Design a protein around this motif. Sequence first.
Motif, PDB file in Angstrom:
ATOM      1  N   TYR A 149       0.899  -1.782  -0.226  1.00  0.00           N
ATOM      2  CA  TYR A 149       0.410   0.243   0.126  1.00  0.00           C
ATOM      3  C   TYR A 149       0.515   1.333  -0.036  1.00  0.00           C
ATOM      4  CZ  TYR A 149      -3.960   3.382   1.195  1.00  0.00           C
ATOM      5  OH  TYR A 149      -4.748   3.572   1.053  1.00  0.00           O
ATOM      6  N   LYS A 150       2.136   1.351   1.578  1.00  0.00           N
ATOM      7  CA  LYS A 150       2.157   2.255   1.530  1.00  0.00           C
ATOM      8  C   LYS A 150       4.102   2.423  -0.328  1.00  0.00           C
ATOM      9  CE  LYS A 150       4.396   4.206   5.462  1.00  0.00           C
ATOM     10  NZ  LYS A 150       4.534   3.247   7.304  1.00  0.00           N
TER      11      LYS A 150
ATOM     12  N   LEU B  72       3.150   1.944  -3.871  1.00  0.00           N
ATOM     13  CA  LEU B  72       2.990   1.634  -4.959  1.00  0.00           C
ATOM     14  C   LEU B  72       2.164   3.437  -4.200  1.00  0.00           C
ATOM     15  CD1 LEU B  72       2.011  -0.583  -6.865  1.00  0.00           C
ATOM     16  CD2 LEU B  72       0.827  -1.560  -4.326  1.00  0.00           C
ATOM     17  N   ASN B  73       1.898   3.954  -3.659  1.00  0.00           N
ATOM     18  CA  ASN B  73       2.240   4.885  -3.004  1.00  0.00           C
ATOM     19  C   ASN B  73       3.736   5.917  -3.706  1.00  0.00           C
ATOM     20  OD1 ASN B  73       2.092   7.864  -0.748  1.00  0.00           O
ATOM     21  ND2 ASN B  73      -0.526   7.759  -1.544  1.00  0.00           N
ATOM     22  N   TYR B  74       4.265   5.829  -3.260  1.00  0.00           N
ATOM     23  CA  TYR B  74       5.667   6.511  -3.674  1.00  0.00           C
ATOM     24  C   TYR B  74       5.899   6.012  -4.962  1.00  0.00           C
ATOM     25  CZ  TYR B  74      10.925   6.463  -3.185  1.00  0.00           C
ATOM     26  OH  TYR B  74      12.118   6.826  -2.827  1.00  0.00           O
TER      27      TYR B  74
ATOM     28  N   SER C 249       4.340   6.682  -7.618  1.00  0.00           N
ATOM     29  CA  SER C 249       4.024   7.904  -8.439  1.00  0.00           C
ATOM     30  C   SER C 249       3.677   9.413  -7.988  1.00  0.00           C
ATOM     31  CB  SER C 249       2.631   7.318  -8.606  1.00  0.00           C
ATOM     32  OG  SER C 249       2.392   6.966  -7.196  1.00  0.00           O
TER      33      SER C 249
ATOM     34  N   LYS D  85       7.386  -0.049 -11.934  1.00  0.00           N
ATOM     35  CA  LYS D  85       5.976   0.201 -11.631  1.00  0.00           C
ATOM     36  C   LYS D  85       4.935  -0.894 -11.974  1.00  0.00           C
ATOM     37  CE  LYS D  85       1.822   3.475 -10.262  1.00  0.00           C
ATOM     38  NZ  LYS D  85       1.790   3.042  -8.973  1.00  0.00           N
TER      39      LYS D  85
END
Lengths: 260, 248
Positions: B200-201, B203-205, B207, B209
Motif C-alpha cells: 500500500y505504502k 505504490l503510493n511512493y 508515483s 511501476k
Amino acid sequence: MLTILKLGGSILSDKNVPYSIKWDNLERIAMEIKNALDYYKNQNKEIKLILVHGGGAFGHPVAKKYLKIEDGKKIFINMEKGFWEIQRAMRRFNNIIIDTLQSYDIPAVSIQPSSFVVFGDKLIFDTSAIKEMLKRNLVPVIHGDIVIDDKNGYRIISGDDIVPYLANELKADLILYATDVDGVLIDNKPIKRIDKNNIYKILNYLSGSNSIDVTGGMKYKIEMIRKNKCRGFVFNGNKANNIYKALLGEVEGTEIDFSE
Amino acid sequence: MLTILKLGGSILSDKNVPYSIKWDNLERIAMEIKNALDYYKNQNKEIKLILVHGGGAFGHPVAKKYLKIEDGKKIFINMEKGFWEIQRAMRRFNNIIIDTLQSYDIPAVSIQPSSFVVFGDKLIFDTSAIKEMLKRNLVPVIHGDIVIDDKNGYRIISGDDIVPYLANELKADLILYATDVDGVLIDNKPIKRIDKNNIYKILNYLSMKYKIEMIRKNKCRGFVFNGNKANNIYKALLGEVEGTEIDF
Ligand SMILES: CC(C)CCOP(=O)(O)OP(=O)(O)S
Ligand SMILES: CC(C)CCOP(=O)(O)OP(=O)(O)S
C-alpha cells in the motif's frame, strides 16, 4: 479476397549450392508482386496476400545433419544444437526475402512457425496474429521451419503443410503455386484445366509410368484444392510476368478449380 | 522445477548506444547460467528454464522512428515499413543472444512474439510450443517485440508482460528479474521484501511501476536483483534470495 502465393526454395535458391540465393529471380519476383499490388490498388479491388516459401538451400542442408534413419525411419537427433541451427538458417533466408520485398515497398512481415506451431495429427497453429496483419494490409511471409511435435520428437513443417492449413483456416480463394515447371504435365505439356470432371482421370494418370512428375507433388496439390473447395494455379515461376499474371487471376499454366 | 529469468535489456545493452551490445557482460551471464544448469545436472534434479530479454539498444531506437506523440498517447506510424524494421532489429538482438548461449551449450531456441502474439483484450499468446520445448529440456528465449493489438493496432510487448503471463500460464516456481539495480529501491535503498501490507505504502511512493503490479495480478512470487554483480545470476538461479523479494 485472400490469395496465398507459394514461392519455394527452388526458384529462389539453388538447392545444390548451400546458402545460395538467386538474387535476380528473387528481385524480379518482388517486382511482379509489387506490380500486381499496384494494379489492385488502381482498379480499386480489395486484396489480402500471404506468401510462403520453402527452406531452399538454407533449411535442407542444415537439417540433413540432424537427421538419421533408425529402424527404417526418420528421427531427429542432437536437437539441443539442431533446433537453433535450423531456425537460424531459415531466419537468414526469411530476412533476405523480406528485405528484398520491402525494398520494393511490399509491406512484408515475418511469421516464424518454429516459435509456436506444434506438429501433430492436427496442426496447432494459431492464426490470430496473421488475420490482424491481413486486416491491416500487411503482407505475412511464412516459411518452412523446424517444429516440435506432440510425440517427444520433431518435424520439418513445409510449405506443402503450411498452405493447405492456411487455405482452410483462413478461407482462401486463390492458391498460387509458383514452381519450376509450366504446369501439371500430361505428355510434357501442361493441362489447361482440372476440375470435378477430370480429376480422378488426372490423378490416375499421375500415378502411372508416363507421368513426368513421379514424386506425387502435383497430386498432393490438386487434392488440397479440391479438399478446400477453391481455386489454384500451378505455373512456371521462372518465367517473366507469370507471377504478375497469376496474381491477377490469369497466368497460363494449369488451373485447378473446385470453388462453389 | 520451472524457473524464468528475465535479463534487463540494460544489462545486455547500453541504452544510450543504439545497436550496442555488452559482450563481456553477455558472456559472463551465459556462463553463470551454464554453471547453474550444470550444478542441477549433478544433483540429478530436473530443472526446466525459460529466458526473457528486452529490446535494449535494439528495440527502442528502432521503435522510436515509428512512434509519434499525437498529443497525448504514443502513435505508431508507417507500420508498413515499421513493423518489419522493428521485427528485424529484435531478430538481430535475439540472434546475438541465442548464439552466445549456444556457445556455452545451453540449449537455447528463438520465440519471436511478433509472429503470433496478439495484445489488446485478453493477451493472446499460445504456449503450446513452449510447453513442448520444455518437455525436451530446450531453453526458449523470448524477447520484447512489436505485436499486433486488435484494439489499438500495434503495441510493444515487454518482458514485464511476458514474464508474469508465462509464470502463471505455466505455473513457474521461481521468478527472476536481473536488472542494473540492487533491488526495488526505496529512498535509494533496496527493500528486503514486499507484502500485501507495505505494498500500500509502496505504490503510493512509486508515483518498475508496471512490474510490481503485473506480478501481483497473478499471485506470483519474484526476485529483483543486480545482474551486473558477478555471480548474482548463478546464485539467484540456485534459489538463493538476492535483493528484493516480491510475494503474491
Ligand atoms: C529443411 C526445411 C526447413 C525445409 C522447409 O520446407 P519446404 O518443404 O517448404 O522447403 P522447400 O523444399 O525448399 S519449398
Ligand atoms: C521492441 C521493444 C522496444 C521491446 C522492449 O521490450 P522490454 O521493454 O521487455 O525490454 P527492455 O525495455 O530492453 S528491459
